[model samples]
Target: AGFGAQHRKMGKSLYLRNEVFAAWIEKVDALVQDELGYSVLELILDDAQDYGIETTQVTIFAIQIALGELLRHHGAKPAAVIGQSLGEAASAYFAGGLSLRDATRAICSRS
Candidate 1:
């Protein structure tokens, strides 16, 4: 996909509706991408400071919840799922070995 299309998908998949924590998580995600040379699948998501999150940590905690919910609600069984970063953890939960809470915790811890 083109860069714009990728960003659009990321915005739809990861953008927080009203939570500040979700926004910050995206910021930290960007930093991690920059430092480690990791490619960001989601690009439209910007810094939490722009959205005014009280704390990045709190945002991350909430973001973990969101990630879990997203996985739980939308996950499907794949033929040998291959994921990147957080998607890898979510796939583990989707495979039925891990609980959503556990997946969320993993995402939170990773960030």
Candidate 2:
């Protein structure tokens, strides 16, 4: 996807109607904010600098969870999803392999 199209709708109209996405994002975003004063969406959608690898990892987890739940609520749930190394944490949570707190804990291991 183009850079413009890729993130133009995050925390906006795209997932606004989906309660699963909205609630999940709030929880995950809150969890990130609780550890650090900033938000995961800000670090990502705003393209901030002076971040750590943990921030990127947190963003990746947030995106996967948000996107996965968005697709699911629209009646397009995946039969199977794959994850790459550290990325496995969020995917597994989406696929029912892990709890939200557990997954968030792992993602925010640095904090």
Cα distance off (Å), candidate 1, residue 23: 18
Q: After superposition, how far is residue 59 of candidate 1 from its true place, in Å?
A: 11
Evaluate model 2: give its lDDT. 0.62
RMSD of each: 10.5, 4.6
Model 1 lDDT per residue over 1-111, tens place: 232333233443566553443544454455445443432323334332222221233233334434544444446333133233234444565444775455444544435
> Against the true structure, whose lDDT is highest?
2
Residue ranges of candidate 1 with Cα displaced over 4 Å: 1-76, 79-86
- The positional error of residue 104 in candidate 1, measured at the CA in angstroms, is 0.3
What TM-score does model 1 achieve against the real structure?
A: 0.30
Candidate 2: tens digits of C-alpha lDDT, residues 1-111: 222223324544444666777676776788778766778756554644423666666776776677676666677754254334225667668665798677877777654
**lDDT (0-100) at residue 31 of candidate 2?**
78
| Model 2 CA deviation exceeding 4 Å by range | 1-23, 35-37, 49-51, 79-86
Clash pairs detected, candidate 1? 21-59
